[PDB]
């Protein structure tokens, strides 16, 4: 917007962290699954 362009200097680092941690966890689980296919 014009004088109300506050969103330009903002970033949702909170969501990014939530998503990043979700991904890291799921990649960790996936890895266990493939490894445990025989121990």
């Amino acid at each position: 917007e014009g004088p109300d362009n506050d969103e330009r200097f903002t970033y949702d680092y909170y969501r990014l962290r939530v998503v990043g941690l979700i991904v890291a966890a799921v990649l960790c689980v996936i890895g266990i699954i493939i490894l445990l296919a025989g121990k």
Binding site: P3, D4, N5, D6, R8, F9, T10, Y11
Partner: protein, 268 residues
Amino acid sequence: FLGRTGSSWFKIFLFYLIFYGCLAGIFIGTIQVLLLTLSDFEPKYQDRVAPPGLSHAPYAIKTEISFSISNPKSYESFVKSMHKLMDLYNESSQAGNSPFEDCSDTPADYIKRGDLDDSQGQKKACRFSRMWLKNCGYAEGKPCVVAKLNRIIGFYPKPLKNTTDLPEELQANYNQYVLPLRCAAREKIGSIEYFGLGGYAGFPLQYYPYYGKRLQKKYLQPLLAIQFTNLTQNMELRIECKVYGENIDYSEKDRFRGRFEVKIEVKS
């Protein structure tokens, strides 16, 4: 030789020459495409400069400016940087209707020169006289520090509204058009004196938004001179200058995020 024969030494050179040549050519290619995705007027991200920093002219050894009044070369170090900044706000530097403009001698509202486009020439910036900085060689005794708000493209600094209580409760509250700066230390052993545009202790909103170096060269940002004519002597005084606003915030880590950290000591 060490490893191989001459014939082998050559072939290993012809390889790494072509190899590293290709790699350099590829690296450069990826740099090209990166640049191709970027604007010339505005950076892709601005969230890391977001809350504006407040910086001053006196080059602090460690957020500190200690010196002796009864000594000449005791403060000549801080006068070097003080001069460096103010030397830019000369009237001879601001000549003609291009690219400067005479703006309200009193704090006014924002000025939009269109978009971040080259569809116009150099966006015309507001003039600023160093003569608006009353009282301030500089203060040989009791320094005359000069404040500054860090430039951010498209940033509209918004002052606080007088809805509720305020630190400098309602005094000279130019609510609509001034970004205030109140310095503090309890420990009240000083004498705060502020100088600026229109005589106000803030930044005139008519100097915003900044259109960037590419669209606004020679642009001048507003200054706020602060003088500490403290009646005390020979002690470290931790003075913090704070700016207030809707778009202004602070951090425990970044001690320059919209504030000062000055340790004055007139050890004379």
